[PDB]
Design a protein around this ligand. Structure first.
Ligand code: CLA
Ligand code: CLA
Ligand code: CLA
Ligand code: CLA
Ligand code: CLA
Ligand code: CLA
Ligand code: CLA
Ligand code: CLA
Ligand SMILES: CC1=C(/C=C/C(C)=C/C=C/C(C)=C/C=C/C=C(C)/C=C/C=C(C)/C=C/C2=C(C)CCCC2(C)C)C(C)(C)CCC1
Ligand SMILES: CC1=C(/C=C/C(C)=C\C=CC(/C)=C/C=C/C=C(C)\C=C\C=C(C)\C=C\C2=C(C)CCCC2(C)C)C(C)(C)CCC1
Ligand code: SF4
Ligand code: SF4
Lengths: 163, 106, 41, 64, 80, 142
């Protein structure tokens, strides 16, 4: 009912599109015998296509006048409803993974600034060090906030500028 | 005209790989700038830039020739094996007029 | 062996080992789990 | 006896210099007497690829 | 023509002269450490402005900067 | 003693080319170079091909000034030979340029006084304020 959109089960265009896809698949599915390989391939394709169309319509995702699904990205409209998975939790999942990556890369590039000729370590990596740091970053929100309160990430204005 | 080769001119070892840009003494010192990588790539084959030893240059060229023909032969073998394992070559052969050639299945 | 393991820290390693791991993981997740476009809830 | 101890690292304050506010060890503070006595040495290259430079003593300052 | 300047930031490496293609600048007395030379631009009627002398000057920042000015037969490298 | 230009000087054996020697060389100027060249030898021309050169001082000439500085530098490169330059205007007046010091401007000669320079750190120049005159490109001291 939000934005004039209707749940995607009551969309005549959505079901018409599903029927269209199934007809287009079957018209060239009827070209092969039930025993050959291409026939089984088309059978499995139709299987997961029907599965596409069935599994989407659960917990509610709005389809518009076109019958296609439309993602709701506002927190608050995903709340007070059931749309928190459209894009609200994927945001936090990507933030977690991107943190993880940046944290690991930063701690690597910092721990390499101490040894002689660090440039080599950037073309010939320290594989065991990278593997160790790769399996230690999945608590980075804890380490990031308290390393921020710490101050070990703010450079005290000792860099090259021109102005 | 005769044959003239040398025995064990360069010992086989994985050391010179650990120092990219060895063929260019200017590059072998170290990558202090990101241009080092691009010069490594743009000069690996520049045999006459490595050193003025035209003997070594001719050896490098005569080796890179086999290096290319090996890839050529693996390419032809890959084409033949695609035609062999997964393709309609028998179907095409029994009816070439309408059946179309296909040798790649996703 | 030693120089070989040292050589295995360059483009022909992670950047290949990496992104091969990642392509494989993503393809397997999209294969076992066929067509996701929204989270479970 | 004029400039900083040799081997002691110091920063730069030449406003127009590639190396600015970052530290670099001194090669040899010119004791013979000249307007740019302190010769500082840097490991990272510049746009021109030079590693060293000489600066005035009114420009360099202490360590971090 | 091309207004060429030489600042006090100089070591007298004698490189911006064995690199200049038009023999425009000279090196006369300077009180240095080992070589003791300083560059100077006594004449500019033949300077084309190729900025080849600015590439070899190792001074940071550069000792010579070519202030681009007006063009002529010499400044446009015209054999016609 | 800086030597001055001398006409009627022999030339090296060469066929021809299509470089320089245009209307500019007749009504505006032409440049001249002279150098020793002992041990008759083969050299390359900057606006042509290869040529031979007798022993004893021989003189050449081209269109642009760099076309002769290139030869002077070449001569530095291989065997220690010491050429010179000359200028020519429309009135026929001749001016000697390289080397005025006789010691190849890269090296100091006993003593002179240069111009177009100021004792100031790099940068630290004047802002566009008070530079409204702008005198083309300012020497900043005149
Ligand atoms: C720039 C970001 C942004 C924008 C443009 C909006 C915009 C909107 N939000 Mg929203 N919100 C946001 C961030 C944002 N929000 C975040 C980060 C949160 C998490 C705390 C929320 C949680 C939230 C809730 C719980 C609700 C909204 C709602 C709304 C709609 C009505 C505004 C309202 O709350 O009532 C008036 C605003 C008075 C200040 C509106 C279109 C409401 C809605 O769904 O509309 C019916 C609603 O109830 N938002
Ligand atoms: C293409 C999308 C993509 C995806 C889906 C992933 C996914 C993942 N990456 Mg990766 N990454 C990517 C792109 C991607 N990355 C790119 C473009 C780069 C730059 C080359 C990296 C560089 C990178 C590094 C350095 C690391 C990861 C790591 C990880 C894993 C940590 C997340 C986790 O398991 O949580 C918590 C458990 C994860 C499965 C980490 C890992 O390997 O885990 C050990 C790791 O350290 N990534
Ligand atoms: C059989 C394994 C083997 C091994 C261990 C080596 C090892 C080596 N080769 Mg070699 N090479 C091989 C096979 C091999 N090659 C073959 C089959 C050919 C024919 C295509 C060549 C043709 C060849 C040339 C032309 C050159 C080398 C060179 C080198 C040395 C450094 C260049 C390099 O390899 O960088 C890494 C290569 C990545 C692909 C190095 C020790 C270079 C050298 O001799 O140093 C001066 C050189 O110029 N190789
Ligand atoms: C037809 C493709 C081809 C072929 C035949 C070769 C062949 C060769 N390469 Mg090469 N290379 C290629 C593509 C190819 N490369 C590409 C696409 C890149 C990335 C731009 C490189 C980057 C590269 C590097 C960095 C080096 C070689 C080197 C070499 C020589 C030694 C490799 C060996 O041991 O065997 C060899 C003759 C080594 C060499 O020293 O060159 C003589 C070496 O250092 N190659
Ligand atoms: C009977 C003598 C003989 C024979 C049979 C060959 C045969 C061959 N030469 Mg070859 N060559 C010879 C003498 C000979 N050469 C001599 C005396 C010289 C002077 C040293 C050369 C120098 C030479 C060069 C520079 C090259 C070849 C190359 C080739 C191959 C061409 C590409 C090809 O056909 O792919 C393969 C065919 C498979 C059946 C080919 C197999 C190319 C090569 O090196 O290949 C690696 C190459 O470019 N030859
Ligand atoms: C000539 C170059 C070449 C190219 C471009 C390809 C490309 C391809 N091959 Mg292939 N192959 C080749 C040579 C080649 N092959 C050769 C010489 C052989 C003989 C050993 C094979 C034997 C082979 C098999 C058995 C299979 C493929 C398969 C594939 C496809 C899967 C992608 C993949 O993972 O590849 C390889 C990745 C890195 C090399 C792909 C489009 C797969 C396929 O198409 O499914 C039926 C398959 O299973 N190839
Ligand atoms: C990060 C990359 C990655 C990951 C995580 C996996 C994971 C998996 N693969 Mg896979 N694979 C990959 C890359 C990857 N693969 C690549 C790049 C290729 C191309 C060569 C393959 C080709 C491949 C084949 C042919 C098969 C698998 C199979 C499997 C499954 C067997 C493991 C199992 O069930 O034992 C137990 C697990 C827990 C007890 C497993 C979940 C097998 C499978 O499908 O499972 C039945 C199988 O047949 N993989
Ligand atoms: C920021 C850009 C962006 C974003 C946000 C997405 C997001 C998504 N893509 Mg995608 N994609 C993109 C760019 C993007 N794509 C581009 C540029 C291409 C061209 C190569 C593709 C080609 C592509 C294909 C072929 C597929 C997706 C699929 C998907 C969905 C799978 C989610 C998943 O794997 O479950 C969770 C992952 C880890 C837990 C997902 C919502 C898949 C899909 O539609 O759902 C079945 C699918 O198969 N994308
Ligand atoms: C799937 C999915 C997800 C996510 C995941 C991820 C996390 C991904 C990623 C990824 C990543 C991690 C990425 C990254 C990247 C990067 C890139 C892509 C790049 C690039 C490049 C460029 C292009 C650049 C350029 C440049 C330079 C070089 C410098 C200067 C500037 C310029 C621009 C020029 C989730 C689960 C959440 C949900 C579901 C779906
Ligand atoms: C909810 C949501 C939303 C909304 C939003 C809003 C409302 C806004 C904002 C925003 C913001 C407000 C942002 C910000 C930022 C800030 C800052 C200040 C920053 C930062 C950064 C940092 C701090 C760092 C981090 C890191 C790195 C990068 C390196 C390594 C790792 C680490 C982590 C350390 C949307 C719908 C859209 C989407 C979904 C979700
Ligand atoms: S710009 Fe060129 S011609 Fe002018 S002084 Fe510099 S190097 Fe010589
Ligand atoms: S090239 Fe620069 S530093 Fe060297 S002598 Fe000339 S002006 Fe001085």
């Amino acid at each position: 009912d939000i934005a004039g959109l209707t749940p995607c089960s009551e969309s005549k265009a959505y079901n018409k599109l599903e029927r269209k896809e199934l007809k287009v698949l079957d018209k060239r599915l009827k070209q092969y015998e039930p025993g050959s390989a291409p026939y089984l391939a088309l059978q499995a394709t139709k299987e997961r296509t029907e599965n596409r169309f069935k599994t989407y319509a659960k917990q509610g995702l709005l389809c518009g006048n076109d019958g296609l699904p439309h993602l709701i990205s506002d927190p608050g409209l995903a709340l007070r409803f059931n749309h928190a998975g459209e894009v609200f939790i994927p945001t936090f999942g990507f933030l977690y993974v991107a943190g993880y990556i940046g944290h690991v890369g930063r701690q690597y590039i910092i721990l390499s600034k101490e040894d002689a000729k660090p440039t080599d370590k950037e073309i010939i990596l320290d594989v065991p060090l990278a593997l160790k740091l790769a399996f230690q970053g999945w608590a980075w929100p804890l380490a990031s906030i308290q390393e921020l309160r710490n101050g070990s990430l703010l450079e005290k204005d000792e860099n090259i500028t021109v102005s | 005209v005769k044959i003239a080769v040398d025995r064990n001119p360069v010992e086989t070892n994985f050391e010179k790989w650990a120092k990219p840009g060895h063929f260019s003494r200017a590059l072998a010192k170290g990558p202090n700038t990101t241009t080092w990588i691009w010069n490594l790539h743009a000069d690996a084959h520049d045999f006459d830039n490595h050193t003025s030893d035209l003997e070594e240059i001719s050896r490098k060229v005569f080796s890179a020739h086999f290096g290319q023909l090996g890839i050529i032969l693996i390419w032809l073998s890959g084409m033949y094996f695609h035609g062999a394992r997964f393709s309609n070559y028998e179907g095409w052969l029994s009816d070439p007029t309408h059946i179309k050639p296909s040798a790649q299945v996703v | 062996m030693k120089d070989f393991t040292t050589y295995l820290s360059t483009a022909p390693v992670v950047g290949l080992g990496w992104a091969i791991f990642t392509s494989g993981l993503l393809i397997e997740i999209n294969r076992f789990f066929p067509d996701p476009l929204v989270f479970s809830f | 006896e004029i400039g900083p101890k040799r081997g002691s690292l110091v920063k730069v304050l030449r406003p127009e210099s590639y190396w600015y506010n970052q530290v670099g060890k001194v090669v040899s503070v010119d004791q013979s007497g000249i307007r740019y006595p302190v010769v500082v040495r840097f490991e990272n290259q510049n746009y021109a690829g030079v590693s060293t430079n000489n600066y005035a003593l009114d420009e360099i300052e202490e360590v971090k | 023509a091309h207004v060429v300047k030489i600042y006090d930031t100089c070591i007298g490496c004698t490189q911006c002269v064995r690199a200049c293609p038009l023999d425009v600048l000279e090196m006369v007395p300077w009180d240095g450490c080992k070589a003791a030379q300083m560059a100077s631009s006594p004449r500019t009627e033949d300077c084309v402005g190729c900025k080849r002398c600015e590439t070899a000057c190792p001074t940071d920042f550069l000792s010579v900067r070519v202030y681009l000015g007006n063009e002529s037969t010499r400044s446009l490298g015209l054999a016609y | 003693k800086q030597p001055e230009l001398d006409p009627d000087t022999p030339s090296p054996i060469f066929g021809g080319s299509t470089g320089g020697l245009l209307r500019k060389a007749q009504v505006e100027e032409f440049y001249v170079i002279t150098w020793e060249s002992p041990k008759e030898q083969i050299f390359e021309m900057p606006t042509g091909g290869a040529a031979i050169m007798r022993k004893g001082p021989n003189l050449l000439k081209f269109a642009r000034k760099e076309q002769c500085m290139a030869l002077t530098t070449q001569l530095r490169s291989k065997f220690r030979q010491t050429p010179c330059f000359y200028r020519v205007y429309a009135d026929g007046k001749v001016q000697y340029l390289h080397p005025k010091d006789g010691v190849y401007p890269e090296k100091v000669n006993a003593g002179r006084v240069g111009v177009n320079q100021n004792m100031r750190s790099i940068g630290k120049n004047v802002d566009p304020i008070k530079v409204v005159k702008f005198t083309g490109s300012e020497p900043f001291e005149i």
